[PDB]
Amino acid sequence: TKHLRVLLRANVEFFNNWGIELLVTQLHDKNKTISSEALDILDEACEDKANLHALIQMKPALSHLGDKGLLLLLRFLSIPKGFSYLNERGYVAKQLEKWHREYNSKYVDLIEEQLNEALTTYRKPQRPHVYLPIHLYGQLVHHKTGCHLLEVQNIITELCRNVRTPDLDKWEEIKKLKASLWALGNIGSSNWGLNLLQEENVIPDILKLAKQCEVLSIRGTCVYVLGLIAKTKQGCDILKCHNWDAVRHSRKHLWPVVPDYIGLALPVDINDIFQVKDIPYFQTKSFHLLRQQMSLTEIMNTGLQEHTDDNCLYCVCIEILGFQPSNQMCRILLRKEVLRLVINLSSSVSTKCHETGLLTIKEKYPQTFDDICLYSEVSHLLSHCTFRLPCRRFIQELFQDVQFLQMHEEAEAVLA
Amino acid sequence: AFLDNPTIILAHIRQSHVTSDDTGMCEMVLIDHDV
Amino acid sequence: IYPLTVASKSTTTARHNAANKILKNMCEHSNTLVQQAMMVSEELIRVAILWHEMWHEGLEEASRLYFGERNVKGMFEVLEPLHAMMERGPQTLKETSFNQAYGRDLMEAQEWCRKYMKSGNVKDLTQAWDLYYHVFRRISKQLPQLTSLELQYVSPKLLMCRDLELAVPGTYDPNQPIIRIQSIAPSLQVITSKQRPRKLTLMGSNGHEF
Amino acid sequence: LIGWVPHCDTLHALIRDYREKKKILLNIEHRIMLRMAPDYDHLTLMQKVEVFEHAVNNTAGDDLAKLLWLKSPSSEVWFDRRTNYTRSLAVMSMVGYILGLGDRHPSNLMLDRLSGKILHIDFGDCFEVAMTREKFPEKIPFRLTRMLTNAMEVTGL
Amino acid sequence: NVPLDLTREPSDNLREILQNVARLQGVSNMRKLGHLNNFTKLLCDIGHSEEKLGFHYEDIIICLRLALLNEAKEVRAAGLRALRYLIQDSSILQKVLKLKVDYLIARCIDIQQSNEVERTQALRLVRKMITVNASLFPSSVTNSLIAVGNDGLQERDRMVRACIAIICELALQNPEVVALRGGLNTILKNVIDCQLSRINEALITTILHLLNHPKTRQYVRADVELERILAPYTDFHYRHSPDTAEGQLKEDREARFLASKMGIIATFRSWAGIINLCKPGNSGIQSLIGVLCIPNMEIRRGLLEVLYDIFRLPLPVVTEEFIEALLSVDPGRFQDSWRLSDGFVAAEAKTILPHRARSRPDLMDNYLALILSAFIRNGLLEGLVEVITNSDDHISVRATILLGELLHMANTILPHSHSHHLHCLPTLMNMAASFDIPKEKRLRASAALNCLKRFHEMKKRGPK
Ligand SMILES: [Zn+2]
């Protein structure tokens, strides 16, 4: 099955009358991977009118497959003989409803999946090729009869109003804007689709949205959809008026010469898109002094500064739970020394000196790290300030071997 | 690329970390049960 | 022309205004000479000490003032000119490089100093010194690695002179025909020392290297 | 912007090259003093003389005297260079005394290769500043050591 | 432990919440561990309520608060597991946060006492607090996660990449708390020393997302946050960590170059990074191109590899002659998938015979056209010419091929207007026709055009 593509790319004589019928029998194989490869090499074969006409006259059954089979069945609408056979059992009227409610937005996911598979290293569960998938709105405008239906149902009015009035706040209503930009760019890929698209004056609206848009993701989507508008000589003249150039040659000759077009368009000056309005930064809108003139022994010969009755482990339970007040000048001058060493430990200028000054207190007075009120004050300070990790583990671990009897006594009583 | 909405970004964050971590921690701490 | 440029660059207002008055008078008969002097003077002083050289010296002095003299009003004034030179924008790739690697830390640490001026909390000042010291440690590890400088990297305006009507510094007497600066060598070598002096080689008008 | 003097090398690097070529350690005299008394910096005035005097007698100081001769192509050039050196060190000793120059360590003393003259640099400590400082005050008008005085001429100073 | 499951729910509730205080007397830790698991099983049967599970929520939290203060890592781990099953809605979460329980949750995060099973239960609970209500995330827990990620590599912490993946998830629903605590700085510094391709992609995407939507760009500074990743290439002496061993200093530089390269590529493939790195004013791209002209030899080789990967061009082989480097770039070179064991002909013929598509738009050419135009406007072509004529013999050959590929990439993908200031090589031609300039340079450019001339013939033949 993989070897049927080399017979397609090499222009084997009369491939369209014995090769297509050999790719239809291979379509009904038991292994899914084999059948999924027969859909890939059949989509590539459909780009020749002789091959596409062959498939229509064979009328194969592609409904039993997945989304890949569905997209291959939507190419039948581009041929007048294939549109009349499908728009005779009532099928395009069912796709139009089914392409409006459910998976008009899913076409964005198909676009995003291939791009994320090409260059993102995402792998949803060497230069590749990313080809635009088939769209129902982009294949129905090839002939006048199909284009007539797209106008009586009046979808263009609904799509156009979604572009002139975008709400770029919610992440779910932005995707509806992408679901309309990708649908407006496919209607503009044909001359018969541009007659009913430029009568509402929507191309200037997209061009404005491609240079002044707050969400930079939409600003990049408009670049892609403007290429689809530049697939015809009539479409490249409209873009030229608004200072947007385009490539006016096909891909069959990779050596352009000055005297169908591939879809590509860029602004004349590349800096007309990269301008972003500036948004201001959000930030734009005591014992410490006295201790440095004396010593710890000299002074000895309420202390909790930021201790209020909402940010303490014990004192917050007096009212809500019904706890009892904590019980008890020699211990009030040690709380200040313990705290003032914590702040000095937040600068890391002289860590060893401050660590030494904290270990001595736990030796001479090991019972000063035995009050929950000090733990809450230290813990409240460890959040606002910024400490290094080794200095953060030194603290919060000096308190490991404590009983904290006051909580246990009160918690036992209130629960009992 | 079109890594724009948070729906795919959260899926990208919690899949690359689990798959490409040598230590057996991300496969244990990023359990989908905690959503 | 040389002493006047030093006076015109002084911090004192009286010297700054008085020196400019003489310079503009000299602009009458000889305007192109003074303009070359300012361009040369501004670039040589830029090459002499770089942006990471200024911060290393300023932070070391400021740290001593805060922890040795316990002076707060004296620490802020040391770091004010350094923070003011970062708001005028990098004018070279070396300054652009410095503003990228260390730019965020210095700019945020200034904001923590603007909150201490108002709130007065000691923790704001302490939190500000956690970023000054982090940057000071990173700069100190790359100063010994500095052994050569490229003019295009540090100051592009020096190697695009190619002609000057200003004399070689230190050589002028009324009884001898004058020598002018022709070009500046595109590479200068840094001598390894505590001050790290540079070796700048000029090019005389008579083909003699200075 | 200080001008660059050509053909001049500092005294400290001049002695260093000679000693390393002769397989002689740079700080032999310093190692002897620390070996005899490790707490050299804390000794009293009388004890420092005993250690210092012992070092200068156990090592013959003539490094500069022999250095200037091996770099002289002939004997006529050698004598001419020596005369300039002797009367160029004397001029800066008397002039430096009046100015009060200090901190004249070997790294700040440069000797000309082609003429033998003596060049002084780093005029930072002037007007007796170094003598009155509380940290290691030097009490000498100028630098005249045994290494320099043994190279000007055989009869002495 | 004996699971009762017989008495009334309040009766079964009473026991374990009495042997959770125990006054540190008469109860062993083993009994508490088995009693805590009883609570989890009980809470699975009777739903979250204050009318069937005896006491109120605020009373249950008080007794569970004296479970994280124990000295046994097994008891603390089971205590945290109980809270994860108790916090379901924002009503309970606000009740668990008012009692300042966050002072103890952050305590278990950083104790590092061989309790990797206890820390996992703490982190698994944080991921639940973010999900329930990300706008009420405490600042105490946030400060702990920043610290373990900011300075968690030198201490050989193994849960370091598991805490950064939690900051990023929190940085998407509540950027306000993360920005104040310097949490957007941590992600920038991690990508510098993270050389795993898949992980490096995820971290940079989170920050670029904050620069995408207009109400979030206020949390990122202008020209110092995003451009930090360009420091290893723009700074000739970069020191990422203030404290590191000097033994692997040479290896550290190579590690930084590789990790920074994966970040530059990762920010040029997103629409929020191209518009931010190519701003009309001073931008990072002008610093990345301006540094290419400086006659450095280590930076120039590094930047060329980045340029090849940005355009997704095949890398040639290192050599000093152009012919050897030209035979290694041809599209028809042998590959390992063409053998009989692998795809015999179908694999080979895919990359030789051309696709049967002459009208289908190639959505990747559109992307490469915009990137190419951005570099041409900034002055890439003039920068490359300086590299060719003023560098080593083995660097010029790598730059001569890049110029050849770019010119071929540009005469088939770029529109007409952008092709008027393109295929004229003003800088190159002037050097190769002037006799005033030093003779050595003249022929370097003349030979470069001669070498570049043969490049077109190789593309003229095509794959064979
Ligand atoms: Zn309290």
UniProtKB/Swiss-Prot annotation, chain B:
Top-level taxonomic group: Eukaryota
Chain positions with N-acetylalanine modification: A1
Subcellular location field: Cell membrane; Endoplasmic reticulum membrane; Early endosome membrane; Late endosome membrane
Tissue: Ubiquitously expressed, with highest levels in heart and skeletal muscle.
S-S bridge residues: none
Self-association state and partner proteins as the record states: Component of the mechanistic target of rapamycin complex 2 (mTORC2), consisting in two heterotretramers composed of MTOR, MLST8, RICTOR and MAPKAP1/SIN1. The mTORC2 core complex associates with PRR5/PROTOR1 and/or PRR5L/PROTOR2. Contrary to mTORC1, mTORC2 does not bind to and is not sensitive to FKBP12-rapamycin. Interacts with MAP3K2. Interacts with ATF2. Interacts with MAPK8. Interacts with GTP-bound HRAS and KRAS; inhibiting their activity. Interacts with IFNAR2.
Domain comment (free text): The CRIM domain forms a ubiquitin-like fold with a characteristic acidic loop, which recognizes and binds AGC protein kinase family members substrates.
Family that this chain belongs to: Belongs to the SIN1 family.
The protein's role, per its UniProt record: Component of the mechanistic target of rapamycin complex 2 (mTORC2), which transduces signals from growth factors to pathways involved in proliferation, cytoskeletal organization, lipogenesis and anabolic output. In response to growth factors, mTORC2 phosphorylates and activates AGC protein kinase family members, including AKT (AKT1, AKT2 and AKT3), PKC (PRKCA, PRKCB and PRKCE) and SGK1. In contrast to mTORC1, mTORC2 is nutrient-insensitive.
Protein name as it appears in the record: Target of rapamycin complex 2 subunit MAPKAP1
Source species of the chain: Homo sapiens (Human)
Gene name in the database record: MAPKAP1
From Swiss-Prot, chain C:
Impact noted for substituting M39V: In an ovarian mucinous carcinoma sample; somatic mutation
Subcellular location: Lysosome membrane; Endoplasmic reticulum membrane; Golgi apparatus membrane; Cell membrane
Binding site for ATP: S193, Q195
Post-translation changes: Autophosphorylates when part of mTORC1 or mTORC2. Phosphorylation in the kinase domain modulates the interactions of MTOR with RPTOR and AKT1S1/PRAS40 and leads to increased intrinsic mTORC1 kinase activity. Phosphorylation at Ser-187 by TBK1 in response to growth factors and pathogen recognition receptors promotes mTORC1 activity. Phosphorylation at Ser-187 by TBK1 in response to EGF growth factor promotes mTORC2 activity, leading to AKT1 phosphorylation and activation.
Tissues expressed in: Expressed in numerous tissues, with highest levels in testis.
Top-level taxon in the UniProt lineage: Eukaryota
Annotated effect of mutating S187D: Mimics phosphorylation; leading to stronger phosphorylation of RPS6KB1. Increased activity of the mTORC1 complex
Annotated positions of the Phosphoserine modification: S187
Documented effect of changing T201A: Increased mTOR kinase activity
Comment text on domains: The kinase domain (PI3K/PI4K) is intrinsically active but has a highly restricted catalytic center.
Complex formation: Part of the mechanistic target of rapamycin complex 1 (mTORC1) which contains MTOR, MLST8 and RPTOR. The mTORC1 complex is a 1 Md obligate dimer of two stoichiometric heterotetramers with overall dimensions of 290 A x 210 A x 135 A. It has a rhomboid shape and a central cavity, the dimeric interfaces are formed by interlocking interactions between the two MTOR and the two RPTOR subunits.
Protein name: Serine/threonine-protein kinase mTOR
Native organism: Homo sapiens (Human)
Curated annotation (Swiss-Prot), chain E:
Keyword tags: Acetylation, ATP-binding, Cell membrane, Developmental protein, Endoplasmic reticulum, Host-virus interaction, Isopeptide bond, Lysosome, Membrane, Nucleotide-binding, Phosphoprotein, Ubl conjugation, Zinc
GO biological process: actin cytoskeleton organization; cellular response to nutrient levels; cytoskeleton organization; embryo development ending in birth or egg hatching; lipid biosynthetic process; negative regulation of apoptotic process; positive regulation of actin filament polymerization; positive regulation of cell growth
Main location: membrane
Modifications made to the protein after synthesis: Phosphorylated by MTOR; when part of mTORC2. Ubiquitinated by the SCF(FBXW7) complex, leading to its degradation by the proteasome. Deubiquitinated by USP9X; deubiquitination stabilizes RICTOR and enhances its binding to MTOR, thus promoting mTORC2 complex assembly.
Cross-link (Glycyl lysine isopeptide (Lys-Gly) (interchain with G-Cter in ubiquitin)): K250
Gene Ontology molecular function terms on file: ATP binding; enzyme-substrate adaptor activity; molecular adaptor activity; protein kinase binding; protein serine/threonine kinase activator activity; ribosome binding; zinc ion binding
Entry keyword annotation includes Phosphoprotein: yes
UniProt GO cellular component terms: cytosol; endoplasmic reticulum; endoplasmic reticulum membrane; Golgi apparatus; lysosomal membrane; lysosome; plasma membrane; serine/threonine protein kinase complex
Keyword Zinc among UniProt keywords: yes
Location(s) in or outside the cell: Cell membrane; Endoplasmic reticulum membrane; Lysosome membrane
Disulphide-bonded residues: none
Modification sites for Phosphoserine: S11, S241
Family: Belongs to the RICTOR family.
Name by which UniProt lists this protein: Rapamycin-insensitive companion of mTOR
Protein's organism: Homo sapiens (Human)
Stretch of the intact protein here: 25 to 488 of 1708
